[PDB]
Amino acid sequence: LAAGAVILRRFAFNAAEQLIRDINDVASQSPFRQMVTPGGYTMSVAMTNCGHLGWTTHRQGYLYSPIDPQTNKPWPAMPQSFHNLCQRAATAAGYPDFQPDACLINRYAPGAKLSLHQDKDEPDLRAPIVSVSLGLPAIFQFGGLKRNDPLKRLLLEHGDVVVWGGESRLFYHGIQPLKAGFHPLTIDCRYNLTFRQAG
Ligand SMILES: O=C(O)CCC(=O)C(=O)O
Ligand SMILES: [Fe+2]
């Protein structure tokens, strides 16, 4: 249960293969990299971005940049497959006007994890975030408006799309260590795309 959240399991099943081809295309321009947090610690999840803006870590904290700090070049353009799926999911969830200008791409290797955090780097917290999972299943955990609220667990599997809007948009959340396994399309990892209106 998550007020404001719209869970569309297997919604992206049909576009999965194409999405994976485009993730590889994006990674060819802006390679996956394990960003270092302001405290000086390497994240276990590997990331990259496509679209006008990209989420990244900085010395002063977190922020969106139109330039890839590693390549010093713009992030790859938002592929059509990405925009089309996000549009259908957003509209289906009730957000037909949602127009993302950034897509953070996370890659989870076996054991990779993402500790509890809030996504508050966006200008308007009223705009939802569309999440698309691919490959191996992962346990998504979330709490409440506070970092010490009751944590709930939700398994996200290949093709699962969740539109995080309303109150859920501000919930603390994370991903538990990815259990080892095999998937025909991603082999041994999980991918997650999150579309955001960062501009
Ligand atoms: O991988 C996930 O399902 C969570 C992605 C996320 O919330 C983020 O990276 O900010
Ligand atoms: Fe997040």
Swiss-Prot record:
Effect of changing residue 147 to A: reported as: No effect on enzyme activity. Decreases affinity for damaged DNA
Q: Where are the transmembrane segments?
A: none
Keywords in alphabetical order, please: Dioxygenase, DNA damage, DNA repair, Iron, Metal-binding, Oxidoreductase
The kind of enzyme this is, by top-level EC class, is: oxidoreductase
Required co-factors: Fe(2+)
Q: State the InterPro entries in the record.
A: Alkb, AlkB-like, AlkB-like_sf, Oxoglu/Fe-dep_dioxygenase_dom
Q: Where does 2-oxoglutarate bind?
A: 106-108, 190-196
Tell me the SUPFAM superfamilies matching this sequence.
Clavaminate synthase-like
**Claim: Chloroplast is one of the keywords in the record:** no
- The EC number(s) attached to this protein equal 1.14.11.33
So where does Fe cation get bound?
117, 119, 173
Which superkingdom, per the lineage? Answer: Bacteria
UniProt keyword Transport present: no
Q: Which PROSITE patterns match?
A: FE2OG_OXY
- Cofactor stoichiometry and binding? Binds 1 Fe(2+) ion per subunit.
- Which Gene Ontology BP annotations are present? DNA alkylation repair; DNA repair; oxidative demethylation; oxidative RNA demethylation; response to methyl methanesulfonate; RNA repair
**GO molecular-function term, one example from the UniProt record:** ferrous iron binding
Query: What is any one of the record's Gene Ontology cellular component terms?
Result: cytoplasm
Q: Catalysed reaction per UniProt?
A: a methylated nucleobase within DNA + 2-oxoglutarate + O2 = a nucleobase within DNA + formaldehyde + succinate + CO2
By sequence similarity, the record places it as follows: Belongs to the alkB family.
Any idea what job this protein has? Answer: Dioxygenase that repairs alkylated DNA and RNA containing 3-methylcytosine or 1-methyladenine by oxidative demethylation. Has highest activity towards 3-methylcytosine. Has lower activity towards alkylated DNA containing ethenoadenine, and no detectable activity towards 1-methylguanine or 3-methylthymine. Accepts double-stranded and single-stranded substrates. Requires molecular oxygen, alpha-ketoglutarate and iron. Provides extensive resistance to alkylating agents such as MMS and DMS (SN2 agents), but not to MMNG and MNU (SN1 agents).
- Which PANTHER family does the UniProt record give? ALKYLATED DNA REPAIR PROTEIN ALKB-RELATED, NUCLEIC ACID DIOXYGENASE ALKBH1
**Name recorded for this polypeptide:** Alpha-ketoglutarate-dependent dioxygenase AlkB
For this protein's source organism, the top of the classification is: Bacteria, Pseudomonadati, Pseudomonadota, Gammaproteobacteria, Enterobacterales
* Gene transcribed to yield this protein: alkB
